Design a protein around this ligand. Structure first.
Ligand SMILES: Nc1ncnc2c1ncn2[C@@H]1O[C@@H]2COP(=O)(O)O[C@H]3[C@@H](O)[C@H](n4cnc5c(N)ncnc54)O[C@@H]3COP(=O)(O)O[C@H]2[C@H]1O
Ligand SMILES: [Mn+2]
Ligand SMILES: [Mn+2]
Lengths: 136, 664, 96, 191, 95, 89, 90
């Protein structure tokens, strides 16, 4: 059914992690959850084909912002793609680029889109350019 | 509920998490001796060794160290956990001794896991350093004699599965005994390290049997028989330092192969003996991690490094790295406390009795078992006597067991040496002694003592050839087919060979993993102690697939001792039934549930007429009860299936007590 | 899920509940029922607040804006819990 | 009077300029001058390696005219080897224990030393068998003290880095565990 | 009832009786270094030591050995029990 | 699950994975418990004082939080690993 | 002191080492079979019971001639070394 994406690492937790895993399974894609120490019992970890501890040693929110460790896990598990859900790294330029460097599909727009719609001013500049109304 | 077999049932302690080395992701493993072997073969490795100015090290931590200290109980899980760090942090070892000896059958038999799996898993985790095994020439890792084609097949498999260096010995120093194993190792492309077992004391010319010339001549024969490296196996730790200097010194002038020395630190002089060996130019020595070293084990690798760092000849070891690997074993060793019963001080009586390392602890056990714990000193004295009775033999598995079996036998039956000579024709000796004198474990140097042979054999006729040369080859196709029927599915070649080597334990292993799964995956504290109430564990079935398990409570037992155990597994509540084999207020009927059958009156239970699972019809008899001795028969209130039973014959009961449950 | 342990480190979200209808009104009836039908014990939830929102006639009308909640203090008055069950269990617990 | 010099550092490492052989030699001279009958060398951490012992003892025998009495711990596993070197350099007296109370953070085995030397050019005067008999008593008695037998009882070569004397290692791990630092024992050693 | 201060309170194990050496009635203790000291003083002992070709031994079993291994807990009773055998069987120790 | 105080009345070990579990470091007894269930506490604050061959130690809060259940009383004998107090984050 | 059989029963005793009438488990394991009854008459070496240690069987023998007294274990019972198993009066 798919082309390149045989396995997906879901780089998130909670509700959206489960949402992505369900979609994956419906598309016959294998899934990898990650979870922080403090989420060891979180039920998203039970809904994947595989799961790995992420961010050992780090504070709880930082654990799911650990780019290096997430990549390690993706590589070690053979993930073709990473879905970042929302929050955490979903809008992080560095993380998306880093996926690119490793040949891992980032499930989202391009780095430049994250760049342009990250600072409110360059977004507004882009709206103006696209010729749509804006707030004074 | 029931405890682990063979140990005192006690609460799981609270353990420190073991210190694991932090290996940065994407660090590369340095190539070491396995690459040389893969590229340039045995002779390439041999040539490399000759070039080395430093003394090389073989690390016995994964095999001999724990065989000597922890009754070979170290489980694979604990071994796989440190293996990756070993590949990165100890890449300059000549070899890791990690297979053979007792590990083969102990794995199946007491650890319920598969030594082939241990070998193959480790092989991937440590791709840079040669792997080494200990093989008894005559019978590999087995418990008896086997036809040549068996020995050949075992070696073939071992070599393929990843063993590179086979240290081949014979229990009596009988070279003929090893010829098959040696040839099969040559045939397989791997390294042959045939070994001479050291015994006696070459510095005492009173003792004219096992002299330096004996050792030198034996060296020459083994080179002629085509070993690549010459093993000296000092299984009892008897080789003193000045003897080691001469012995090694002289062997280096005599043969043109590298020498590999193996000792035990039983006497406390192992390092010193290694220091002498190193001054005489020995090529390779056997060491263990500090925390698994000393006493009946090998000397410390890190202790040797520091003993030599300021001398004229060093080891190539990174001290600090070995210290880091060592922290892991310091912590892990706590798990095996119930098997850490070796005394663990020096013991210099070995120079008198000559019991090899393992057998001392082992034979003390049998002595205590059989009521002789108070007479352990007599038994040791008798071991010495019996060794003399046999003409002074090399004592190591299985020759050692013979001397042990007779030593026990004679103390138990209040028998002297003279009594044996006088009444021997009317005494039934232990089977190992009969087997020994029949030549079933080969031919001793200087031959058997004639008078004692005749009196043990009782007319029977010795053999003088390898017991195995005269055995019917095994039909692999036939055995395979027999095993497939027994297992219920197609076995692997390894399954077959293991079945042949150890048929009873192999099938006991299969039964065990069919019932409980591959328990090899369990962490060692849980393997041995189960779980505490309120505890949570993580069981790694496989990379990425973890069961998170919590023990919530343990139910009260019913009549047959069955208890419900209440767990959570990955957030799912799960109730499982466990029969409590040793049980040291009674429940009332829930009146709303008509499946609950209750005592009508106060009295006792005469007889229970049904079993759990039985099928019954309205009015059928379930049990018979008594009330001032006037019997009544409690009937099934309807059609159904008998469930739980809460009472036993004899049980006192009161009206309302729940007796039996009958499901609709 | 039954047995989970909510921690203080991440979002509190337990479940997103969604309802659909051919009309907004139809979807509204269902949101009300479903919110009431939920049983969650062991922790407090925001359900009392969601119900207030979903029952408020400004919500039903479809005419609300950014300021609705912040300027509608009725939404922050809550009925007294009926916990007759819990009390009954304390009694049974105590005598037992 | 057996006044003693405590050994520390590593005289085979000339990076380390404070506690050098000359330091030890000068200190020997002073103590003879101060009037000791025997010179004690107290290697409380087991840091004196074998080649250093040979030189140190050898040189001290050329320097002072009193007998030398060496005391070490077998913490590193090399105590016997170090004693063997000391003995080749002519040391007069060494400290040993019964086997069963020897090794690790204790003294090397008296009976082990006897056998390490019996075939060399210089021996001990000990009756092996008699010491073995005394040793059986300690083998049995030691079981009584299991609740205090908490020393780790393997070699420990980190002593060459941290230099904690024998007793204090076990002792200080205790205080560390007590105070909640059992997990950070390695940091404490570094500190 | 209350256990010994500082250890896990557990049942008294069953212990082996310690192996004591059998010293025949009327065996005499060999003289050793204490006699030399008593007769000829420190310098007599020192001179004696200088004449010894063999390495001499001081035994730390009764002090330093158990200070290092057993937190110095070895009790006098256990020490007195073996002391007589030490005098008879180990008479050549320096100290 | 409801809580009931038992007016008229084996010792539990720390779950090592949970850092809310505060455990005895050493074998001894409890001299004094310094806090109550519900109390609010800061990293390093005193929770209880324990004894080891009579040499006192003060078990500190591993972090900021709210004191939950208490498993020991003054006088209680304790062994290392025993769960003493729980401190919720 | 009088003896009464408790018809409905719901820490195990160690040998008094000084009393050689006390027959104790040598090793940790379980009891496979008890071969004698209270009152039975026995000779030095006679079998009293059979015990197991990692499944390797051993037969506990009478230390001397005598009369079997109390029995503290049953078939199946788990046992630890030092546990008092049987008493054999002289
Ligand atoms: N003449 C000398 N020059 C320098 N140092 C000396 C020495 N004599 C003794 N030592 C020191 O004492 C240690 C052991 O001497 P030992 O004869 O007891 O024990 C020696 C001896 O049994 C034997 N060995 C070594 N070299 C030897 C040689 N050149 N001749 C005879 N035997 C030797 O191996 C053992 C270990 O020797 P290693 O050097 O490893 O360890 C030596 C060395 O550190
Ligand atoms: Mn060996
Ligand atoms: Mn000292």
């Amino acid at each position: 059914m798919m082309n390149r994406i045989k396995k997906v690492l879901v780089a998130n937790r909670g509700e959206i992690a489960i949402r992505v895993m369900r979609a994956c399974t419906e598309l016959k894609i294998k899934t990898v959850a990650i979870y922080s120490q403090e989420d060891t019992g979180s039920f998203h970890r039970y809904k994947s084909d595989e799961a790995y501890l992420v961010g050992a040693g780090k504070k709880p929110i930082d654990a799911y912002l650990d780019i290096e460790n997430i990549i390690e896990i993706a590589k070690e598990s053979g993930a073709d793609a990473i879905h970042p859900g929302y929050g955490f790294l979903s809008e992080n330029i560095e993380f998306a680029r880093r996926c690119e460097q490793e040949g891992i599909i980032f499930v989202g727009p391009k780095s430049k889109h994250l760049d342009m719609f990250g600072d409110k001013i360059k977004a507004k500049e882009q709206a103006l350019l696209a010729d749509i109304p804006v707030i004074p | 509920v029931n405890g682990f077999p063979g140990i005192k049932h006690r609460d799981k302690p609270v353990y420190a998490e073991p210190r694991l080395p932090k290996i940065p992701y994407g660090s590369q493993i340095s190539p070491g001796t396995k690459q040389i072997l893969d590229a340039k073969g045995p002779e390439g490795v041999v040539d490399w060794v000759k070039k080395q100015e430093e003394v090389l090290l073989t690390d016995t931590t994964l095999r001999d160290a724990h065989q000597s200290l922890l009754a070979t109980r170290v489980r694979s899980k604990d071994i796989f956990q440190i293996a990756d760090a070993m590949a990165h942090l100890l890449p300059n070892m000549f070899s890791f001794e990690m297979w053979g000896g007792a590990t083969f059958d102990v794995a199946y038999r007491f650890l319920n896991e598969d030594p082939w799996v241990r070998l193959e898993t480790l092989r991937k985790q440590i791709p840079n350093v040669m792997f080494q095994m200990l093989l008894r020439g005559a019978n590999a890792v087995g418990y008896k004699n086997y036809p040549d084609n068996v020995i050949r097949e075992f070696v073939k498999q071992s070599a393929q599965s990843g063993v590179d260096v086979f240290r081949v010995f014979d229990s009596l120093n009988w070279i003929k005994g090893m010829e098959v194993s040696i040839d099969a190792v040559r045939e397989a492309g791997k390294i042959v390290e045939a070994a001479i077992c050291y015994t006696g004391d070459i510095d005492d010319d009173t003792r004219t049997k096992y002299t330096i010339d004996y050792y030198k001549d034996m060296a020459k024969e083994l080179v002629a028989q085509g070993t690549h490296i010459l093993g000296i196996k000092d299984m009892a730790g008897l080789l003193k330092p000045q003897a080691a200097y001469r012995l090694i010194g002289e062997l280096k002038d005599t043969v043109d192969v590298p020498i590999h020395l193996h000792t035990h630190d039983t006497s406390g002089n192992g390092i010193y003996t290694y220091a002498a060996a190193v001054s005489a130019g020995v090529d390779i020595v056997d060491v263990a991690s500090s925390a698994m070293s000393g006493a009946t084990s090998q000397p410390s690798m890190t202790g040797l490094y520091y003993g030599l760092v300021n001398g004229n000849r060093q080891t190539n070891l990174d001290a600090q790295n070995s210290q880091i690997i060592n922290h892991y074993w310091e912590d892990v060793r706590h798990y095996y406390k119930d098997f850490d019963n070796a005394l663990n001080s020096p013991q210099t009586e070995v120079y008198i009795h000559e019991m090899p390392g393992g057998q001392y602890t082992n034979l003390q056990q049998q002595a205590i078992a059989v009521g002789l714990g108070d007479r352990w000193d007599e038994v040791k004295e008798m071991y010495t006597v019996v060794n003399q009775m046999f003409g002074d033999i090399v004592k190591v598995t299985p020759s050692s067991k013979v001397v042990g079996d007779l030593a026990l036998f004679m103390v138990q039956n209040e028998l002297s040496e003279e009594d044996v000579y006088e009444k021997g024709d009317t005494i039934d000796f232990p089977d190992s002694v009969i087997e020994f004198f029949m030549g079933e474990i080969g031919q001793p140097y200087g031959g058997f003592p004639e008078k004692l042979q005749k009196l043990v054999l009782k007319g029977r006729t010795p053999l003088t050839d390898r017991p195995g040369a005269l055995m019917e080859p095994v039909n692999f196709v036939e055995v395979k087919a027999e095993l497939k029927e027994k297992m219920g599915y197609e076995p692997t070649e390894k399954d077959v060979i293991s079945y042949i080597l150890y048929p009873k334990v192999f099938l006991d292993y299969q039964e065990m993993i069919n019932k409980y799964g591959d328990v090899t995956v369990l962490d060692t504290p849980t393997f041995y102690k189960g779980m505490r109430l309120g505890e949570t564990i993580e069981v790694e079935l496989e990379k990425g697939k973890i069961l998170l398990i919590k023990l919530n409570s343990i139910g009260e037992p019913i009549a047959d001792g069955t208890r419900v155990i209440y767990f959570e597994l990955n957030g799912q509540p799960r109730e499982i039934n466990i029969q409590d084999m040793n049980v040291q207020a009674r429940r009332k009927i829930d009146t709303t549930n008509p499946e609950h059958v209750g005592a009508t009156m106060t009295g006792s239970v005469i007889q229970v007429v049904v079993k759990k699972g039985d099928s019954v019809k309205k009015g059928d008899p379930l049990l018979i009860t008594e009330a001032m001795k006037m019997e009544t028969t409690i009937q099934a209130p309807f059609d159904g299936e008998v469930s739980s039973i809460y009472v036993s014959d004899g049980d006192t009961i009161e009206s309302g007590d729940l007796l039996i449950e009958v499901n609709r | 899920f039954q047995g989970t342990v909510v921690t203080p480190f991440y979002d509190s979200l337990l479940v997103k509940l969604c309802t659909w209808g051919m009309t907004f009104e139809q979807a509204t009836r269902k949101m009300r029922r479903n919110l009431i039908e939920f049983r969650i014990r062991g922790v407090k939830t925001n359900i009392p607040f969601l119900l207030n929102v979903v029952r408020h006639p400004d919500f039903a009308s479809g005419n609300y804006n950014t300021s609705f909640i912040d300027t509608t203090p009725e939404l922050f008055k809550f009925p007294h819990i009926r916990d007759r069950g819990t009390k009954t269990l304390r009694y049974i617990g105590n005598v037992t």
